[PDB]
Amino acid sequence: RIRLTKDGRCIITCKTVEVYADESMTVDTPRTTFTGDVEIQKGLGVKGKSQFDSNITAPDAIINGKSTDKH
Amino acid sequence: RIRLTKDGRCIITCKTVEVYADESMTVDTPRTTFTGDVEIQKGLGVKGKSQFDSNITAPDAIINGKSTDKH
Amino acid sequence: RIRLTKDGRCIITCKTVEVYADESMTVDTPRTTFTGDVEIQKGLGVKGKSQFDSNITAPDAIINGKSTDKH
Ligand SMILES: [Fe+3]
Ligand SMILES: [Fe+3]
Ligand SMILES: [Fe+3]
Ligand SMILES: [Pt+2]
Ligand SMILES: [Pt+2]
Ligand SMILES: [Pt+2]
Incomplete structure (x- = not known):
């Protein structure tokens, strides 16, 4: 379940999240x-x-x- | 390609993953x-x-x- | 907003990104x-x-x- 939100929240809710990024991942945020x-x-x-x-x-x-x- | 899975896997497969989160990102999981x-x-x-x-x-x-x- | 890209970019753009992964998250990429x-x-x-x-x-x-x- 991936929810997109007016007000600006992106919510991913599951058991495991698996990211396979062949080259790179970039997280551009002030705080993680x-x-x-x-x-x-x-x-x-x-x-x-x-x-x-x-x-x-x-x-x-x-x-x-x-x-x-x-x- | 973003796959959602019965059994509870969320799989994102690409070359690069770019997250632009204006304020914050929070990863709430026992182990990353x-x-x-x-x-x-x-x-x-x-x-x-x-x-x-x-x-x-x-x-x-x-x-x-x-x-x-x-x- | 989640964009998938020919050329292979996965772009998530919002105010906050919230991942709730009950068990684990795995980021398989050469560089994050x-x-x-x-x-x-x-x-x-x-x-x-x-x-x-x-x-x-x-x-x-x-x-x-x-x-x-x-x-
Ligand atoms: Fe000394
Ligand atoms: Fe000493
Ligand atoms: Fe000494
Ligand atoms: Pt500093
Ligand atoms: Pt501890
Ligand atoms: Pt090394």
């Missing part, structure tokens, strides 16, 4: 919110400041060009 | 998986625990309120 | 780009290398199994 968990299966780039409210885990963190595991 | 790379062009907030399986790179990491580049 | 901010309300896993162009903030960072707040 995921209510659950997220997995990224290749890499991540982030331009702006990031806050993690809980602990992060990483094999190493390269800070201002310097190793953290080996500093 | 991206098979490829992801870029976030403003900021990131994450509530729960994060694991990075590979090295991360950052100009600085502010840990429990303390600089890592300058500690 | 968010132009704005992103919040993840549970956890994040990332397989590949991550770059944060700006400072990150975390209560702690567990690097190669070691605490950063308490090392």
Whole structure:
């Protein structure tokens, strides 16, 4: 079920949503919110400041060009 | 091509998917998986625990309120 | 407004996009780009290398199994 709304809401309601985009997907919006968990299966780039409210885990963190595991 | 499915799958299959949402997008699902790379062009907030399986790179990491580049 | 395109673009244009996926969402594409901010309300896993162009903030960072707040 895909509802389009006067007032400007686009609502997709189902069990699973599967997007297969051969080349790319672009989400052009001021803010995107995921209510659950997220997995990224290749890499991540982030331009702006990031806050993690809980602990992060990483094999190493390269800070201002310097190793953290080996500093 | 957008398929809606008895059994509850919503399948969007194309070359590129472009979402232009003037105000916001909200994805309310227990788990979202991206098979490829992801870029976030403003900021990131994450509530729960994060694991990075590979090295991360950052100009600085502010840990429990303390600089890592300058500690 | 949802446009499907010869040439292979799927364009969704509205004020807000709301996805309610009872079980999961999967985005199978080489690259997904968010132009704005992103919040993840549970956890994040990332397989590949991550770059944060700006400072990150975390209560702690567990690097190669070691605490950063308490090392
Ligand atoms: Fe040290
Ligand atoms: Fe130190
Ligand atoms: Fe130290
Ligand atoms: Pt910013
Ligand atoms: Pt959690
Ligand atoms: Pt990679």
